Amino acid sequence: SFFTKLTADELWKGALAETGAGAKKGRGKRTKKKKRKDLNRGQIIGEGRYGFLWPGLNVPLMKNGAVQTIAQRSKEEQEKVEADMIQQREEWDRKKKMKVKRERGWSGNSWGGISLGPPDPGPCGETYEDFDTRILEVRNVFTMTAKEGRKKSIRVLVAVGNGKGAAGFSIGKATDRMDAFRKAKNRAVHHLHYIERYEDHTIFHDISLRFKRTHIKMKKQPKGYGLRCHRAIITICRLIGIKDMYAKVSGSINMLSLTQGLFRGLSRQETHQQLADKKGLHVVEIREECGPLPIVVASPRGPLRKDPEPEDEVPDVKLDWEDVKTAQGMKRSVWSNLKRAAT
């Protein structure tokens, strides 16, 4: 009955069933979800079955400087209004339910290659639109508690960069995915690591290192080489602004440790100006495109050393049998040189 009827919000709650057993424990349901809707906002308060014309709410009160009168909308006009209101509701529902296209990054159902846009402005006012953000990985961490048992806590890792040699990584933990994204983004923009680069597209020299049982070997490369490396390192290279190099990971595959060791190496790498200032010699580059011509790179800011370095013969140097194989050319593997994706 009308007395039995009641307001909308409690009906919506009882129909949607956001809480009570299903939502708790994370069991959820098998991809069934009732969409929220508001019927009062849709139709104007005036129309009904009997199409009385209301000068107060439905029709403008005055026309030609003459007060209006209550009148009847004929049944044909009533059917026209009903039809166009059906059309309007169908259009509203169409606009409501539609596709969602988050650009495919590393793969479907993965948060790897997606960017959340630049960081948010600071409280004092600091626009970071020059920065670009990327989500390295996402995981569902779980820890239990006394009374409620298993707690789910979304942990996320993100990186941010200019494209100008400046960038920063961070992680964010929170109960909500968007909240974790926001926290990690803020911490990344506030924790920044800068690294120099030789000619806008390369590291200064190849480096081999290890960090928590994660061996990394980055190799400088000439122009037009591309980025044939891990997908995460490719994304952060796009962030930094370097366009080509090579890299290999050996041992464990743990992207956070990978990134820590990688930024450590790219920070500890030495510039050629610093190298000349330290040694006391002129740096001299030679290319394969250019013939036997010494291109001076940098000179020591201090006084040049008079005696040059002695001839270093059969030096004690540790290297990698993998590189030995690749240089001698006997190595064979179908998986080494492939026509992989663009960069």
Chain residues that interact with Mg ion, rule: CB under 5 A: 108
Cα 6 to Cα 3, 9, 17, distances in angstroms: 8, 9, 18
Cα 219 to Cα 20, 146, 238, distances in angstroms: 57, 51, 17
Binding status of residue 293 toward another protein by CB under 8 A: no
Place of tokens 């920063």: 168
Binding status of residue 137 toward RNA by CB under 7 A: no
Binding status of residue 54 toward another protein by CB under 8 A: yes
Binder to RNA among 89, 96, 104, 191 (CB under 7 A)? 191
Residue 176 carries which side chain, given as an amino acid letter?
D
> Quick check: helix, strand or coil at residue 215?
strand
Cβ 115 to RNA, closest distance in Å?
A: 19
Q: Which of these ranges, 51-59, 80-88, 233-241, 280-288, lies near another protein under the rule CB under 8 A?
A: 51-59
Is residue 213 within 8 A of residue 251, CB to CB? The reply is yes
Burial of 133 (0-12, 13-18, 19+ CB in 10 A): buried
Binder to another protein among 37, 89, 104, 205 (CB under 8 A)? 104
User: What part of residues 239-258 is at the interface with RNA (CB under 7 A)?
Assistant: 256
Cα–Cα distance, 306 to 274 (Å, whole number): 19
Binding status of residue 61 toward another protein by CB under 8 A: yes
338 binds, among another protein, RNA, Mg ion, none (CB under 5 to 8 A by kind): another protein
Binding status of residue 138 toward RNA by CB under 7 A: no
Binder to another protein among 100, 293, 314, 341 (CB under 8 A)? 341
Residue 138 carries which side chain, given as an amino acid letter?
V
Residue 57: Cβ within 10 Å count: 9
Task: Note the residues at the interface with another protein (CB under 8 A).
Answer: 2-3, 5, 7, 40-41, 45, 54, 56-57, 61, 104, 107, 123-124, 223-224, 338-342
